[PDB]
Structures are given as C-alpha cells and as structure tokens.
Write a protein that binds this ligand. Structure first.
Ligand code: NAG
Ligand code: NAG
Lengths: 593, 201
C-alpha cells in the first residue's frame, strides 16, 4: 500500500519543515524588531533555504497520486504539497513575471504626485498624499491629490499590468485552471467530503446572493451620506446622483470612517472614550495585556505561555532601535507565540490588544496538528476570529466590569446610534467596494472585458454597484485599479468580504449560547465558559476539516449567511429609514458626474 | 547525625526538568542555617506552615532542588497550567509541601553558576497525524529526560529520537543568568510509616 509510503514521507517532512520554518520566522522577527544591515541579509538567507526546501519537497510529493489514498488527513496534507503554482512556466517566463511584479511593487512604493500649482510639492503616497486625502475639506486640494496619484503612478502601471494578466493567465491555464480568477477562487474549494463539499463556482453564487441582501442597507447609508455631504460641498453634489470619488475620506474610498465628523447623528452626546480613565489609574502597557488575558481566561480559554511575556515587545524600545510600528501576532513555530506592538495608553490600543491576542489564542488551538494543517479553516477565518473579541471588549458592560467606567454609568440610547453609525462606515461602507473590485478582476482574468474596455467597464461598474462617479474623464491610458495596494502587489481581495460575513455569524452564534437578552450589538461573551468551549472546539480543528464542517461546528450551518450582519445593524437601519423620509434613496448611473 | 546538605552546596545546580532529589531519613536537620547560607526571597507552604516546617519531626524529608529564577515563580504556582508544569515539574500536593526561593551571594564560590537557565517547552510524540503531547505526572519526571540529557545550546533547540512508529521530540528554551544566582527548593514531608527520626537540631 502506497499510503504507508506517504506516511513516512509526511513524517520526515513535518520535522524538516518545523525545524526550517522556525529559523525563517525568527530571522523575520529579528529584522522587524531591530532594523539593521546584518539582520536583513540574515532574513533573506534564511528565507531562501526555506523556499528551496519547500520547492524540493513539493516536487517530490507528486510521486504519490491522490486517487488511491483513503485517509482524509493524509490526502489533505498531500494536496497542499502537490498544489504547484508559478513553478510551471519556462525559466524565461518565470523571471519575466518576477521582474514585472517587482517593477509594479517598486513603482507603487516609490511614486510621487506634485502640485499643479506648486512645483515643489512632490509628495509620496504614504506620508503626504494620504494626509491630504484623509484630513482635508478643500474640494480642489482633494481633487488634485486624487488626480495626481491616478495620473503619475496609475498611468505607467498599465503596460506592466497588461503583461501581468497574460503571464498569470498562462500559469493558471498550465495548472488545469480556467484562468487566474479560478486559481484565486480555489482557496474556498473543498473536495471528497460527504455533504461538506464546495465548488469554485459556488463562491460567486454565494457572494452575489449575500450582496443582493446587503444592498438595501447600503442604499440607505449612501443616501444619508450623500445628503450630509451636500452641506460641506455646496453646489457640487447632485441630490439624486452618485458621489464624487475624491470626497470619500481616503484615496480610494475603501472605508468611509473618515467622514464621521461631518455626519455625527447626535452632536451633543460624546462617544464613550476611556483614555482619560486609563491615565488616571496609572495604566502602563503591561496592564492592558494582563486585562486582555484575563478577559480571554474568563471565557474558558488558556492563559498566555511563559515565553509570551519574556519574548514579546509590548513597548517601543528607547535605545535608538529601529522597529516597525505595525501591530502583529507572530506564530514563530515550535509553540512560540509573540506579539509586536508599540502600545500607547489609549482606547484604540486597548482594543488592538484584544484583536491581536485573539490571533494568538487561535494559534494556540491548532498547535497539535500536522505542519501543513496548521492554519485557519480558510483565509477568512483567522481575521474573523480576532474581530469578535474586539466587538465584545468595547461593550459598556465590559468596560464597567473591568473598572474603566463609573459603576453608576447609564447607557444612553443616543450614543448607541453614534456607535452604530461609526461602525457602519468601515463595515457596510466597504462591502460594495471590495465586491466590485473583485468582480472586475475576475472578468479581466476571464477575458469578458477586453484590454480595450478596462477603464470603461471599471467606471461603469463603480457607478452601478458602488454608486461613486469619477471627478474627471479617464480614457484608456490609466490603470485606476492598479493604484490600490493589493492590485499592484498581487493579493487576493475576497478574503475581506467573507471575513465580514463570518464575523457576525460567529458572534450571534456565541451570543445565544451565552444567554444574552436584547440587541445583538450590546452582547458580551465574557464570564461565559460554555461559549468559550464551543469556539475552542472549532479553533482546535485547524485546516484539518472542510471549512463548511468547521463553520457548522459553531453556527449550525454550512453556508455563508448575511442575516446576522443585518440583525446587528437593525436599530441603525430603522434610524436611517426614519431620517431618509424627506430624501431620495438610490442613485443615477449615467447622470451628473 | 546532621543531614548532609553538601550536594546542593557543591557543583552546578541542576535545571528544573532534571531536578535533584535527596531523601533525608534518620538525621538532624537545621534548615535555618541553610536558609542563612542564601538570600531568601520567597517562601510559600501548602498544608503546612513555615514554623511547622522548621519544627516537627517527619518520617521522610524529600528535597527536590534545582536552579530557578524569581521572575518565573508565578508560573510554578498551583493550578496554573503552563510549560513548566506540563513539561518540567508538577508539584505533588497530596502531601504538605513548601516552595522556597533563595539567592546565592557572590561570596559562595563553592557553587558554580551555569551559563543559562534551561526549561523544556515541548516534549511530544510525533506521528504523521500531528502531535501528541506528553504531560508530566505529579511528582514524577518527564518522558524526555534521556533525550534532553544531551543539553541545549541555543534558544528553542530541539532533539529528536526515532521510534518504531514515529519519533519523539523535545525542545528547550535558554535564558542567560545575570546577577546573583537564584535557586529553588521543593520540600515535602512524609508522616506515613517509618520513624519520625528526621528531627530538628
Ligand atoms: C539589534 O538589537 C539586538 C538587541 O536589541 C542586538 O542583540 C543585535 O545585535 C542588534 N543588531 C545588530 C545588527 O547589532
Ligand atoms: C491563568 O493564570 C492565572 C494566574 O494569573 C490563574 O489564576 C488561572 O487559574 C490560570 N488559568 C488557566 C486556565 O491556566
């Protein structure tokens, strides 16, 4: 039996990969913690060996065909190894694709836009253009900042992106895939299950079926946002048309969170903030993580490990050390869990602590699995698990219990609407955009949109789906989608959609177990061990069962469902319907730009 | 006859996972002098009091001593399930016990300071189906003693031994010693059968 010759190969590979990936992770951690010239060279040296070993083992793994292995675990481990990607083209095509990807990344990372009026105002996207596009109210300043980025960087990316599409489509079709979009959608595929199967073509159906139900709430939110943006830019927005693309709160309008000060529902009730209360009680950066660990323990989850407290960097070093300020949770390998964060005494960092410790709690759960099966059920689970913790941590009851609020605090019904509206500007305000973008890319990879209709179809879709019109006409010499970080860096974008659907699917499911009475947005799962056991049962599975089975372990269903997401925003939906009686809900595609 | 406390005063103290156990029977003990030989930092007793530890005669007096910093005392606390309890040492609470921390002054040159503190983080049996973690019995030793005997050089170093149906892996974490050496004792007193001859001096 060839299954036993697969078992020994997997036994060798597990140990070799465990011993070789840990060194790469440690080198990356050392570089990200102390940025020097030796550390980066060591990081590259360690990352080359891991890639070479993985390529060799993936090539060797094809010796065992999959149609005779009967153990589901062995077959699942073998499929991950036998799945080969870019290592199928010729050497010339491979190096051409690598050069194109590197050129696109460095064009995005080192692009400047200069003021049409001031010739000494050439700004990078990160420090300057972002600052202009998130902290301005001038129509002309925002317009020039938008157009300069779209014309100086997005214009010289299209020749590269045109060859990138063909080169990636060739690689995808050299692997029994219809196109590169099918390759990307393959991350949600599950085979050889009894009733827990999932086809690549089912993802499109599920995404569209969820978007159809999402549409009305987004229409009401868009109507309210448009009606409140009129007072800030008079005689600039039509009362029945779309929204200009340069007034949305950032470069691309991915999130609407930066529009909150212009549309606060009740301006006399201030939102709950506990930074002053944390300062008054002398809260350092260690007590925040101690309280996060206490909250995680209160639901029946394990403590943090001994090495977490010794090796993690919870504060910025003072001895001139150069670090990356992005907060991350690191699965270094052999039961080594760390968190890299520059903690400040603020509410945002208090929530970020719980968000990043949820990732670490997820990594603790599947540590007793094979090396290849040590991931989330899919790409959307690992980020959805870390958001329910942040949802529970910010509730007024939790803040009262931990001691950050006076015991006599009374919950107003007007701050709830403010909180809900600020929540439905990052969550509901990004679901169309994300979806739209992916759709475009899929069509571009499918050949449905010819290379001579990219900008036309892009803006037609963004006018029809998102409801956003361009400020100036754009012919087919720009590449507007390529101006976004993920498009230029070759990253899948559907993981941000399903993440938002699982997130409220878990939270509702864990809130009925915890015996919570009232609206879902006020739910707290703390001091409920029964709700923690149910979560841990799914967390411990890892990538060892189909994600449909893992999802059913918690929510009781196999399919993505959007009803909990609409149940979360029910009071806000009622308020939005109440406030939109004297306005028009909906937009007009080809009308006033 | 004074009980022989020389072994803990000579040579390099052992690590936690390889703790040294000495059984005292039929001797006169003066733990106060030994405590004076160090800088005592912590002293926590369960089912017994420190006054009832210095006094009172016991059938057997078991001292499990090892090297242990004071910063990791909270991880040795009863009930907390972590790496130390799971893979290094699980204190046995069926009988009254005492956990004593101390600090060796630099004038005591009879004891050699080890390079680092070492404790086991993982000790598991690895098949192709994943990992099966082996947990310490209360009062016993770890299954990975023979494999860990070779010692560890760097942080998170792993040793593997092939078996008939897979392998056995152990992992060690290393932290250097800075300052006066700290070392811990677990003292267990037995009342059961054989003569309360372990008596104070
Ligand atoms: C970076 O800092 C660490 C400790 O902060 C130090 O051990 C290391 O040597 C530094 N990097 C270089 C290249 O010296
Ligand atoms: C977690 O650690 C605390 C010590 O702060 C302890 O009281 C508690 O019992 C521990 N819980 C678990 C599940 O290990």
């Amino acid at each position: 039996t060839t299954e036993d010759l697969a078992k020994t190969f997997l036994e060798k590979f597990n140990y070799e990969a465990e011993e070789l990936s840990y060194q790469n992770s440690l080198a990356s951690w050392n570089y990200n913690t102390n940025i020097t010239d030796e550390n980066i060279q060591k990081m590259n040296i360690a990352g080359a060996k891991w890639s070479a070993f993985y390529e060799e083992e993936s090539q060797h793994a094809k010796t065992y065909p999959l149609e005779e292995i009967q153990d589901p675990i062995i077959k699942r481990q073998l499929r991950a190894l036998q799945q080969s990607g870019s290592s199928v083209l010729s050497a010339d095509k491979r190096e051409r694709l690598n050069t194109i990807l590197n050129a696109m990344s460095t064009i995005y990372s080192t692009g400047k836009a200069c003021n049409p009026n001031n010739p000494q105002e050439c700004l990078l996207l990160e420090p300057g253009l972002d600052d202009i596009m998130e902290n301005s109210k001038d129509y002309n300043e925002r317009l020039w900042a938008w157009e300069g980025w779209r014309s100086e960087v997005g214009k010289q990316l299209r020749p590269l992106y045109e060859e990138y599409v063909a080169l990636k489509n060739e690689m995808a079709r050299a692997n029994n895939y219809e196109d590169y979009g099918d390759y990307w959608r393959g991350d949600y595929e599950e085979e050889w299950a009894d009733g827990y199967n999932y086809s690549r073509n089912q993802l499109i159906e599920d995404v569209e079926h969820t978007f159809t139900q999402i549409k009305p709430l987004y229409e009401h939110l868009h109507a309210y946002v448009r009606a409140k943006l009129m007072d800030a830019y008079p005689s600039r927005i039509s009362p029945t048309g779309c929204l200009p693309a340069h007034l949305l709160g950032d470069m691309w309008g991915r999130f609407w969170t930066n529009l909150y000060p212009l549309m606060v529902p009740f301006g006399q009730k201030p939102n709950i903030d506990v930074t002053d209360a944390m300062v008054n009680q002398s809260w350092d950066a260690r007590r925040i993580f101690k309280e996060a660990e206490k909250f995680f323990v209160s639901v029946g989850l394990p403590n943090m490990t001994e090495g977490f407290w010794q090796n993690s960097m919870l504060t910025e070093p003072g001895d001139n050390r150069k670090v990356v300020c992005h907060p991350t949770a690191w699965d270094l390998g052999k039961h080594d869990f760390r968190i890299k964060m520059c903690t400040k005494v603020t509410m945002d960092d208090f929530l970020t602590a719980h968000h990043e410790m949820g990732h670490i709690q997820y990594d603790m759960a599947y540590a007793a699995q094979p090396f290849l099966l040590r991931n989330g059920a899919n790409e959307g689970f690992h980020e959805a698990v870390g958001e329910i913790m942040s949802l529970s941590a910010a509730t007024p009851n939790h803040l009262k219990n931990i001691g950050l609020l006076p015991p006599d605090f009374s919950e107003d019904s007007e701050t709830d609407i403010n909180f809900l509206l600020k929540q439905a500007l990052t969550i509901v305000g990004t679901l169309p955009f994300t979806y739209m973008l992916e759709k475009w890319r899929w069509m571009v990879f499918k050949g449905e949109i010819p290379k001579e209709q990219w900008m036309q179809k892009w803006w037609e879709m963004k006018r029809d789906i998102v409801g956003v019109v361009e400020p100036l006409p754009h012919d087919e010499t720009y590449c507007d989608p390529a101006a976004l970080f993920h498009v230029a860096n070759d990253y899948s974008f559907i993981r941000y959609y399903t993440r938002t659907i699982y997130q409220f699917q878990f939270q509702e499911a864990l809130c009925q177990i915890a015996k919570h009475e009232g609206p879902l947005y006020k739910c707290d799962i703390s001091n409920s061990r029964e709700a923690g056991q149910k979560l841990h049962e799914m967390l411990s599975l890892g990538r060892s069962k189909p994600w449909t089975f893992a999802l059913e372990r918690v929510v009781g269903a196999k399919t993505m469902d959007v009803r909990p997401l609409l149940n979360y925003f029910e009071p806000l939906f009622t308020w939005l319907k109440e406030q939109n009686r004297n306005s028009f809900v909906g937009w007009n595609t080809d009308w006033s730009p | 006859k004074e009980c022989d406390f020389s072994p803990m005063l000579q040579g390099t103290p052992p690590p936690i996972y390889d703790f040294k156990r000495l059984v005292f029977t039929n001797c006169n003990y003066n733990l106060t002098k030994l405590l004076n030989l160090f800088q005592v930092s912590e002293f926590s007793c369960h089912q017994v009091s420190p006054s009832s530890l210095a006094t009172g005669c016991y059938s057997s007096l078991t001292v499990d001593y090892f090297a242990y910093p004071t910063s990791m005392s909270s991880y040795l606390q009863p009930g907390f399930a972590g790496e130390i309890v799971k893979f290094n040492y699980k204190q046995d609470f069926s009988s009254p016990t005492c956990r004593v921390l101390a600090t060796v002054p630099s004038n005591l040159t009879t004891i050699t300071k080890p390079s680092n503190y070492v404790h086991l983080t993982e000790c598991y049996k690895g098949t192709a189906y994943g990992k099966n973690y082996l947990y310490n019995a209360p009062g016993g030793y770890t299954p990975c003693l023979s494999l860990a005997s070779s010692g560890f050089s760097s942080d998170r170093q792993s040793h593997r031994q092939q078996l008939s149906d897979g392998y056995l892996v152990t992992t060690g974490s290393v932290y250097a010693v800075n300052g006066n050496l700290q070392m811990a004792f677990i003292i267990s007193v037995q009342y059961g059968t054989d003569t309360n001859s372990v008596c104070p001096m």
